[PDB]
Each structure stands twice: as C-alpha cells, then as structure tokens.
Amino acid sequence: LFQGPHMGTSLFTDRATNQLYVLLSGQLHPVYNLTSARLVLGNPANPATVKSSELSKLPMGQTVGIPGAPYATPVSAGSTSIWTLCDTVARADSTSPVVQTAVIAMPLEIDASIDPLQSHEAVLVSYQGETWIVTTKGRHAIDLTDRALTSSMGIPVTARPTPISEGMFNALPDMGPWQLPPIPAAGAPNSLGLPDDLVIGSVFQIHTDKGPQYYVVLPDGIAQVNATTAAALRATQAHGLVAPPAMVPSLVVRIAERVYPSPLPDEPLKIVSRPQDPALCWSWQRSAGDQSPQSTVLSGRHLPISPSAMNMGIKQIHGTATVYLDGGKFVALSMYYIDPQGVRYGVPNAETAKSLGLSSPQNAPWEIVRLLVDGPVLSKDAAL
Ligand SMILES: [Ca+2]
Ligand SMILES: [Ca+2]
DSSP states (O other): OOOSOBOOSSEEEOSSSOOEEEEETTEEEEESOHHHHHHHHTSOBOOEEOOHHHHHHSOBOOOBSOTTSOSOOOOOSOOOOEEEEEEEEESTTSSSOEEEEEEEESOOOOBTTEEEOOTTEEEEEEETTEEEEEOSSOEEEOOTTOHHHHHHHTOOTTOOOEEOOHHHHHHSOBOOOSSOOOOTTTTSOOSSSOOTTSOTTOEEEEOOSSSOEEEEEETTEEEEEOHHHHHHHHHHOOTTOSSOOBOOGGGTTTSOEEOOOOOOOSSOOEEOOTTTOOEEEEEEEOOSSSOOOEEEEEEESSOSSOTTGGGGOEEOTTOSEEEEESSOEEEEOOEEEEOTTSEEEEEOSHHHHHHHTOOSOEEOOHHHHTTSEEOOOOOHHHHO
16 A cells, blocks of 8 residues: 655755755755655655755755645545535626635535525526526526516516626536427427317316326327426417316327427426525536546535635635635546645646655546646656
8 A cells, every 4th residue: 555655865855944955866956845856756755854064065956846836745535526616696686796706625515505406496697698597407598688488488577697607607518598399380280189279389288186287289299298388388379278278088098198398397497596595506526436427506595615614715816716625636637636725737647646646536527627727737857
C-alpha cells in the first residue's frame, strides 16, 4: 500500500527562510514550492531541515519550479465524489435581479428547505434573451411571450423568469421545448370508428373506478393522457366540445392504444417562487463502485450544506464561483489536482501523479470542474 512520505536526500528547507532547495545533478537549485520539487525529483519527497550554514558549502544554481503551482497537493479523505453546482439569485423581484454561483465538493445536507425538485415543480429561467423551464429532467425551451401557450400549459402570468448562470445553463441537459407533441392531422375526422364528434386531436374520457381516464384521438389509435395534458390540449383547441365526451369502455377495447409523450406532470404544475427559493442546484455523484453517474436538480432556500460550511466559502479573484471544499481533490474528467482554494491544475500523466504522491483520482463532471479557475499544468518539463 505504501502510505506516507518519501524520504530522500535531495530536498532541503532552511530554518529561518523556510525556503526550499532541491539537489539536482550535484548542484543545489532553489525551488518555489514543494509541488515543483517533487516534479523534478520524481518522488513525493518530504523536505529535510538544514541550517543556512550547510547550504553555503554547496554552490547555488538557477531557480527552478512553477511559481503558480499550489504549494503542496493535499487531498481529503474521500472516497465519495459528490460535486454540486448552485445558482443563488439575489433580489429576484428587482430590476436588476442578480445571480451568484457556488461550486460544492463535500457531502450535502438535504432537507425540506432545500431538496430535489419534485416532478410537478419547475423553475422559470432566463438566459441570453431566451426563457427556459427547468424541471427534474433538465431545461426545456419555452416562449413566455406567448400567453396563449403559457396559459394552456399551466404557467400563470404572475410567474417571472430569473437569470441562470452560464455554468448552470451548460450543466442542465436540453430536453426540447416545453410543448404538447404536435398532431398535424388535428381537426380531421377520425378513422377509428369513433363518433364524428371525436375528430383527431379531440379529447374524450372513460368513467372508471379511480376517477376519469382521458384519451387523445390520434390517427392510428387512442393515447392515454393525464388530466393536465387533457386540459392543455383542450385549452389550445377543443374542436367544439364543451367537455370531453364520455366513452363506454366496451366501445374502445378493440381500438389500438398508442403513446402521447406529454411533458406535463400528473399533479398540477407548481412554478417555484425564486424570492422564496433562490437556490437552484445541479448535483452529481458517481460512487467508485463503477456504475453510471447520478445527477439531480435541487431547489431551495439556500445552499445544501451546514450553516458552518457557509463560513468556509472561498470566492476566487480570477473566477466566477464561490467554492466550498473540505480539502484538496484529485479528479478524472484527463486528470486534475484541485487545491483547497478551488483552483484546478492539470495532471498530464500518471508518472506526474506518482511524483506528486497523488493516486486513485475520483471521477468528477467536467460541467462543474471547468468552472474552477484554471492554474498552470503540473509538469516536470516546466518545473525545470
Ligand atoms: Ca434550511
Ligand atoms: Ca422542495
């Protein structure tokens, strides 16, 4: 297993300056950081003390190293790899609503105030002039200028979009527009042996035990739709019917049954109020047990971490996000070392990793890692 430090004879540290020195080909070169020293030595050496006196006997050389590299490369105890991206919108009713972004690589604290979006819940979002609807699935294009459509899909006029960050926009998969699947032959007489009333695109119902079951009339059969979709269909075009005509179950039992893929949920749509729930998250995890990654959209009152973690947030100067980390990470998207201040440094190959004493990198999503400030590549070629 070989855990712990490397003990060599080529790396030294002064008593007063705490400056590092690396012994290269008999000549003592100085080095910016412990990270760079290990790059050139080819081993994760731990420095040995030495009073300035002994440094004098040996001659000095040109300084080597990577000034922008992290000092060392510590990693926390994981194991687990949970990566979460969060948008928090400040003053959502304002003029002037504003979004801030958090990157989180630590266990989450999920509760009723901040938890996954439920199936019937959705967030209206604005990005570069266009509006989108965010659900458990991802983001769907939606035209909020079109009140006829919005009213038909159950989106109230009180509903307002809030800005989503570029990072969160890119992290959310595109699920296609928020619309009812087209029925181009709609309004045309049916060919199923149904009454002439029930034209293609019309909605009927069968009265069962556990409440009515709605059906849309399609060219090649009848398709089951939920109440939401039935209401949606009829709101855009009812084809002259005050209500969906009732069907005796014996009349449709030999009609072909088809699927109508409405994105509308069973329960009535609930558009979340951003001033009430300003946080919108995309959370990703993939336990080392091989598998496939698992991602989920969260919505809530604040970040899904303990209140004590809130004081640990580091906002990078060269960056967009506040980063919440419980120690350094070694990840594979192509490998990166990520320091506790949330800077990513490229690790080009496995021998460079071995030199640094980094091993067993965790899988992590590029969608989140790329948002971290990009530091210099950790390479011996540049360490020299
Ligand atoms: Ca809370
Ligand atoms: Ca909730």
